[PDB]
């Protein structure tokens, strides 16, 4: 088996429908609690802001089908097969097994894309829709949450994901973060309209932000082996240099949050201890007592953990990436221009020795106001 | 299992040596014939240009060890273990199996890096050398043949590859192609000095360029399933649309050169037939007979096959990538801004219907002029 075809772009065939009103269609890979992380969770929150009184609503599942357990967090929605065509106000349709099957697409069906392959499909549905109903192309809403070609080496998927940004028909970009919008602007992408939303502190975490802290000798690592953008292996190699080169490294505890993984030997009997996904209560507790953080994001997006860590009194090691430099956002953030295990280890020694106030990101504490503005354009 | 280390950056330990003169040390992944294409082949050709009368020469194999047959094109070099320290004028040392072992590194050993991990090792050796011998850092010569972070998704390997360009010690960059140089300059990378060499037609192909041409209805495809940058699966998907959409597709032969693969069914009983690696002679004969070419390169680098095809009278489909647009170089080249299977297929239809002489890249048919200037500088 050599790579022949591209699974992300399996045709997404439609048939016509009699359904009359405006209907917003959110294309998401999955709604499984299993996959209820970052992007999908944000898209759903955003989709929830659209006025139900003004738009019917359908969620189309592109990659995975839910459990009965999964559907419990969508009780108000009707679960409906694609062979069916029913005028429900709220519905969910599984469509990850698409071969020789179609989904009903109405004249005024409007599409909201998330993952690049969902936008890839939406842009082909819109053309089919235009030809079929004899109408000008409807606007697509594209919730852009990272430069998704960066999830791939230069390859077919890289250029197909980038192709979604070069689409010339009507398309509203909504960016996760201003920095990401600006990265897109600098590369010269054009959209009919552009919007962004900024990172906002978790509401549970904010309630702990003013608690008295009793700082301990803890280095807190954002550890996600499965998300390569988080540079897990680079952090681990940096920790090994730190442990060997710093003679006081035995005084320190090194802890991982994010993704549960096996504890890793770092030298001198010291381990990176994985806690994984904590409740927000427990995470807040760990942040209050932690003194140094490491959180890398190979992307123009700031990522959330460095922002959380900085507001809880941690000196936080993170990375510059092109237009992104978080060192200007908050006095607790240390940004590395040259990212190798040696510089990370050196910086960690200086920070450990520092253990022995200024914020320019007031937006982060105290959101989708532009949704009404978008409602009127769709 | 999870990765805990980064294999590309395994320590590359040195020990001192008494050897006296200047010595040029080519760091290459391997010299095996199976890998004697692309970058490594070009690095050896450049290395060959340096004066044997002025420099001792050593080749250091960082990834793979030669078979007896592989050393037959290196009869003038002595093959020596890293445990030995001999003052030969010409030698090859294997150093891919590194653990608990050292390579001898003399005071005036100068390093020539190729793959990014070889530059990453060189930059550490140089610092070690500077401290051990009490000398200012020696210049590294860096043969940069592509933007190598682009061989990875955003990841640890991505940033480590990029860190080789951000190194602040003395470093001369030698770029494969002016386009690649411009790409680097546009991203703001700094080096002590910058040189580049331009694409030159293979001399054996050149011998067939003046021959009579009997053009057939053949579409020629550069098929490299293993080289993601060549977007094989994209081409296959565009070919399947072409076959289905173009009612005259049954008139055309579609042939693949580059890497051997199974013949792929495209529809209508038409196959993409794989010829794989051909002698230069057979390739020339095919080029003289083919009328349309497809060769993709997801990289600022031009790649060679588009240029080869365009000089043999083929109408060539290729891609733009940032500062690269090959349609300005030669009238036979069509460059696609929007790269999807549909646009490729549509272009192929236009070129087929075209079946029913202007070059701005003269350098190509008329290379290391800077070697002397570098020699004086090292």
Numbering used by the authors:
A (entry chain A), B (entry chain B): 26 to 381, 389 to 398, 402 to 413
What did the article's authors report about this structure?
WsaF is the first rhamnosyltransferase to be structurally and biochemically characterised. WsaE is a multifunctional enzyme forming both an α-1,2- and the α-1,3-linkage; WsaF is a β-1,2-rhamnosyltransferase. Both enzymes utilise dTDP-β-l-rhamnose (dTDP-β-l-Rha) as the donor molecule. In the CAZy database, WsaF is annotated to GT4 family, which is the largest retaining GT-B fold family with currently 11,446 entries.
The crystal structure of WsaF was determined using single-wavelength anomalous diffraction of selenomethionine (SeMet)-labeled WsaF crystals at 2.28 Å resolution. The N-terminal domain comprises residues F26-F222, and the C-terminal domain is formed from residues T228-N381. The two domains are connected by the loop Q223-N227. The C-terminal α-helix S390-L413 crosses between the two domains and forms part of the N-terminal domain. The N-terminal domain has an eight-stranded β-sheet that is bounded by six α-helices. The C-terminal domain has a seven-stranded β-sheet that is flanked by five α-helices. Three regions of the structure have poor or no electron density, indicating conformational flexibility: the N-terminal M1-N25, the loop between β1 and α1 in the N-terminus (Q58-G63), and the loop that connects the C-terminal α-helix to the rest of the protein (N382-E389). In the crystal, two WsaF monomers form a dimer related by 2-fold symmetry. The dimer buries 1900 Å2 of solvent-accessible surface per monomer, and the statistical score provided by PISA indicates a dimer, which is also stable in solution. The conformation of K302 is disordered in the native structure.
